[PDB]
């Protein structure tokens, strides 16, 4: 038996293709706030894909507060995609991925908030709250949390590869990568305004490039815009 090149991944996105992801300048991003709320409460009895459905429900109900701007009363929709082949219970057993190692896995939280490029990307106020929220959450869920802050595109590519290649993955049971930045559809910005394609990020962790994580669940969370469209929302009939 052989493997496809890529499998056993789940990727949560703060917004839909073509649209903006919303962030509160004091409370942080809508998606990260909902993710941490659900995961903190339900990881003990709900698998990750089902928790992301609960996150979808929180995001669907939220609306923007930004008086006098185009984001006032705006809407957003999160989504997730999955090549998982079993239930993913984090266990903070039979029909689920094995998830008993100590630590449960390594986790990387990569946050870009300060930008200085020829692109006009604004300081991400509240991104510090997102960063500390996820570091706290993943420690609480039993992960060894590595952190990176304000990286260029090339730095992100090289240090993501180094993280994927760490020897510890041979003996742990899962992996988490969270990326928080400005973005466009299918790519995220480094602090230099250059793009890192998400397909190259996922490739670093696939069955060919990361044999230590073959058949182990790999979670990705992407807090970044995927386009310039603001969602004005729709009245419910």
């Amino acid at each position: 038996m052989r493997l496809p090149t890529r499998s056993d991944m789940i990727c949560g996105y703060a917004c839909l293709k073509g649209t903006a992801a919303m962030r509160n300048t004091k409370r942080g991003s809508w998606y990260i706030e909902a993710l941490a709320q659900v995961f903190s409460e339900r990881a003990c009895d709900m698998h990750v894909a089902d928790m992301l459905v609960k996150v979808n429900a929180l995001i669907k109900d939220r609306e923007g507060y930004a008086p006098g701007t185009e984001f006032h009363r705006c809407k957003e929709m999160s989504e997730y995609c999955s090549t998982l082949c079993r239930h993913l219970y984090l266990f903070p057993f039979q029909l689920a991925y094995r998830l008993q190692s100590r630590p449960r896995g390594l986790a990387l939280v990569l946050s870009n908030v300060h930008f200085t490029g020829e692109k006009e990307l604004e300081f991400r106020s509240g991104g510090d709250v997102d960063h500390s929220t996820l570091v706290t959450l993943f420690k609480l869920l039993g992960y060894d949390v590595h952190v990176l802050c304000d990286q260029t595109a090339q730095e992100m590519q090289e240090k993501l590869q180094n993280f994927a290649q760490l020897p510890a993955h041979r003996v742990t049971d899962s992996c988490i990568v969270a990326l928080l930045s400005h973005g466009v559809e299918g790519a995220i910005y480094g602090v230099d305004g250059k793009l890192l394609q998400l397909q190259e990020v996922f490739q670093l962790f696939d069955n060919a490039n990361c044999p230590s994580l073959q058949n182990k669940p790999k979670m990705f969370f992407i807090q970044a815009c995927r386009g310039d469209e603001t969602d004005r929302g729709v009245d419910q009939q």
Binding site: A20, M22, N24, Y65, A66, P67, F71, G183
Partner: peptide, 5 residues
């Protein structure tokens, strides 16, 4: 206030 990423 809410802003876009």
């Amino acid at each position: 206030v809410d802003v876009a990423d």
